[PDB]
Design a protein around this ligand. Structure first.
Ligand SMILES: [Zn+2]
Ligand SMILES: [Zn+2]
Lengths: 196, 97, 138, 114, 87, 134, 38
């Protein structure tokens, strides 16, 4: 395109529980980093490298319009799998998505946005090196990138699903009796066949 | 135990550093989480290796990987990693006597 | 002279309790923060959530001056502690534990595009002309 | 090539021309701020990109035990006989067989190619 | 999995909160496992040997128990905390 | 002058303070009494072209802590306090950062191992039960 | 004869005498690199 090939190649992010991807810089805006220098500091650790700086130019232009964290959060919330009825609820939904659904291994606490920005910037930084050819692409066949799910972890995968059903079942059983006005028997609320 | 030891040693937390310091230092990853940066990667690996071989803080199945070119130290403690026992060689000699 | 070999040793005191808590305020180097113009400042909890578990908002010189937002450090110092040494007339160092660590960054002030306005630009996000002109129209 | 950031909001500065003076100006967006450009080059891309690998090479690689070491290429900076040689092995080169040498002497990260 | 994952899974499960307005809470803390047991027709438990499971087409399973603490609040400035050990 | 006003007098005086990172055991010993007004002495030795910082633990407290300085030019740090009477003030500006390290290397890990084991007490594990619950 | 081969390009004078005077070169530069056939 006329302007499509002028900006170059832009980076997007496919966050969980969002129907459509979002520009990468928007995610940084939502995390609380507004100025371009603050965002680029988490992506490019050596500003003396002109090659890296150019790769992020199209991404910055794509998210130029969004200039505030709340604006960015609304954009993320607007594309959520369950769009909010009002703008305020959209921001809350987007905050929850980034708080827990995005990079959960980095953290789930309310004050882990800075840690998630660094790792997200590292993900972008790793992508740029692959695009720039500085680092070789990862090999799926390489067996150190693999993990083996043995009996334990496989069983632990089942137990949480089956334990969630157990906890859901007691909630349903108790709710019927509590609404009826009578206390409930814990022994009777538990369905032992769920786990067995 | 790995994170507690790393904090005790000269590893700076990500929150408590300026981004300008990340260029020279090596990123420290524990189970894929960028814990911090360290200014002396070679000494840290020697210390990390020593602890594992003495089984002091680092268990035998903990794998520490240093990517010298990429300035990254990756420590993995999760399950599912396939490993095998290998004899340690120092100064072109077997430690097995 | 004496400075070439000066040796200084001072006593360390750890009061059990203090009326005022101690926390660290951190400013990024690129911010070029200067306190000479900080004639007046305001620090208060944010109102966006609408208390002790919410971010801190810092305003300098009212609306005219720069505004900074402080966020508590998510990483906890379970295996670490921070102390600050302050000079006192008695000549003994005093160490106070860091109750909290806050990271402050400047907030730009201008006619930032609103959420409703951003919707119109989303149509032209892929294809836009004269990025400078978009702000002029607003 | 130089990337400039605004001094007010720390945002990107993009090139702009003032017809009044006909001088390149790096003007901040959404900030009504302008700066005097000096480089005079706003954009440059090298298709061949004959970027030196020595700049990319990191002196720490001399500590890698998996790299070969040769005593036949002494370091020019310090004269240390031992050196660690390797290939760039980086994409976009299309021909990666030349060897880059890094001095193995500690504190001397001299890098050279024959 | 038995020694750590099962206990962690139970510990990490959120407490069950129910509102009527009396309020009810359920917290699961400790996990116990008995040796593989088989219950006869009369209901008498007995240790289940792996060969007997193979011969009689049984499942070599161990009973699982969890300590459950229940707290109830009836907006009457009284709190009753009853624990069902080894549920 | 208002409730939200910040007493920036400390900034005007350009008072300098030192930020120190210390382990928990050193602070834990201080937290033991925490009311005697004394926990140790901080000794700083300077030479013609080198400066070293070390800390000594109190003899009563026990019943060497070398200090390493760090550059502070990469980040600007300030210290402020909030008064219980709703009067915020700025104590000063950090001028140097230091870290504390253990003199011992081998037996020091033994103390750390106890802490790791001690912090493992709340870590609940499944318990084998000899007799089926009836 | 010069060791470096150069080709300076500028927009028409009539237009100088609508999209953008600066971005348009990038569009031309990218367009000429690939779309144009020698
Ligand atoms: Zn600006
Ligand atoms: Zn050399």
């Amino acid at each position: 395109g006329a302007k499509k090939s002028a900006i170059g190649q832009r980076i997007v992010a496919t966050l969980p529980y969002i129907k459509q991807e979002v520009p990468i810089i928007i995610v940084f805006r939502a995390l609380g980093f507004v100025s371009d220098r603050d965002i680029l500091e988490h992506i490019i650790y050596d500003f003396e490298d002109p090659e890296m700086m150019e790769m992020v130019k199209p991404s910055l232009d794509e998210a130029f319009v969004i200039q505030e964290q709340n604006v960015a959060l609304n954009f993320i919330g607007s594309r959520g799998a369950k769009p909010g009825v009002t703008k305020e609820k959209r921001i809350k939904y987007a905050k929850e998505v980034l708080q827990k659904e995005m990079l959960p291994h980095v953290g789930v606490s309310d004050f882990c946005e800075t840690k998630k920005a660094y790792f997200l910037g590292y993900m972008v930084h790793r992508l740029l090196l692959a695009a720039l050819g500085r680092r070789e692409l990862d090999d799926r066949d390489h067996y150190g990138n693999k993990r083996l799910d043995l009996a334990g972890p496989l069983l632990a995968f089942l137990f949480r699903g089956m334990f969630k059903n157990l906890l859901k079942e007691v909630r349903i059983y108790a709710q019927k009796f509590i609404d009826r006005g009578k206390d409930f028997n814990l022994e009777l609320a538990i369905k032992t066949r769920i786990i067995s | 135990p790995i994170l507690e030891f790393l904090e005790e040693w000269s590893m700076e937390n990500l929150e408590e550093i300026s981004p300008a310091a990340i260029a020279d230092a090596t990123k420290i990853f524990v189970n894929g989480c960028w814990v911090g940066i360290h200014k002396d990667p070679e000494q840290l690996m020697n210390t990390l290796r020593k602890l594992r071989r003495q089984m002091d803080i680092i268990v035998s199945e903990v794998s520490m990987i240093r990517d010298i070119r990429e300035r990254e130290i990756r420590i993995y403690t999760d399950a599912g990693r396939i490993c095998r026992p290998l004899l340690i060689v120092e100064k072109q000699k077997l430690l097995l006597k | 002279g004496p400075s070439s070999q000066n040796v200084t040793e001072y006593v360390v005191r750890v009061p059990k309790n203090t009326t005022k808590k101690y926390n660290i305020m951190a400013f990024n180097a690129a911010d070029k923060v200067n306190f000479a113009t900080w004639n007046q400042a305001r620090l208060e909890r944010d109102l966006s959530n609408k208390p002790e578990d919410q971010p801190w908002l810092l305003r300098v010189n009212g609306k005219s001056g720069r505004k900074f937002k402080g966020i508590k450090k998510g990483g906890v110092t379970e295996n670490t502690s921070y102390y600050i040494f302050t000079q006192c007339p008695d000549g003994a160092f005093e160490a106070f534990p860091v109750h909290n660590w806050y990271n402050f960054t400047p907030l730009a002030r201008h006619r930032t595009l609103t959420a409703e306005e951003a919707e119109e630009e989303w149509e032209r996000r892929n294809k836009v002309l004269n990025h400078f002109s978009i702000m002029q129209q607003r | 090539v130089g990337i400039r950031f605004c001094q007010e909001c720390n945002n990107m500065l993009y090139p702009k021309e003032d017809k009044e003076n006909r001088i390149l100006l790096y003007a901040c967006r959404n900030c009504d701020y302008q700066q005097e450009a000096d480089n005079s080059c706003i954009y440059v891309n090298k298709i061949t990109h004959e970027v030196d690998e020595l700049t990319q090479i990191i002196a720490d690689v001399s500590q890698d035990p998996t790299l070969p070491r040769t005593e036949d290429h002494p370091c020019q900076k310090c004269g240390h006989k031992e050196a660690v040689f390797f290939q760039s092995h980086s994409a976009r080169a299309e021909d990666a067989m030349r060897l880059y040498y890094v001095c193995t002497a500690p504190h001397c990260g001299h890098r050279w190619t024959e | 999995f038995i020694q750590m994952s099962v206990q962690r899974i139970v510990e990490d499960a959120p407490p069950i909160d129910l509102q009527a307005p009396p309020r009810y809470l359920l917290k699961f803390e400790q996990i116990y496992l008995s040796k593989p047991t088989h219950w006869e027709r009369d209901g008498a438990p007995s240790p289940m040997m792996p060969n007997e499971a193979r011969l009689r087409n049984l499942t070599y399973s161990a009973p699982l128990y969890v300590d459950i603490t229940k707290t109830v609040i009836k907006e009457g400035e009284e709190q009753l905390q009853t624990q069902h050990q080894k549920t | 002058a208002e409730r939200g006003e910040l007493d920036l007098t400390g900034a005007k005086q350009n008072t300098g303070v030192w930020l120190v990172k210390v382990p928990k055991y050193l602070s834990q010993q201080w937290a033991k009494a925490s009311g005697r007004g004394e926990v140790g002495k901080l000794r700083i030795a300077k030479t013609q072209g080198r400066t070293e910082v070390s800390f000594t633990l109190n003899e009563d407290l026990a019943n060497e802590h070398p200090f390493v300085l760090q550059s502070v030019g990469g980040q600007t740090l300030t210290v402020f306090t909030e008064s219980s009477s709703d009067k915020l003030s700025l104590e000063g500006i950090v001028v140097q950062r230091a870290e504390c390290r253990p003199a011992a290397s081998e037996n020091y890990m033994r103390l750390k191992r106890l802490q790791i084991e001690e912090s493992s007490k709340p870590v609940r594990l499944s318990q084998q039960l000899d007799k089926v619950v009836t | 004869n010069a060791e470096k081969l150069v080709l300076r390009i500028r927009i028409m004078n009539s237009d100088e005498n609508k999209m953008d005077d600066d971005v348009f070169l990038r569009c031309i530069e990218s367009n000429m690199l690939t779309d144009m056939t020698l």
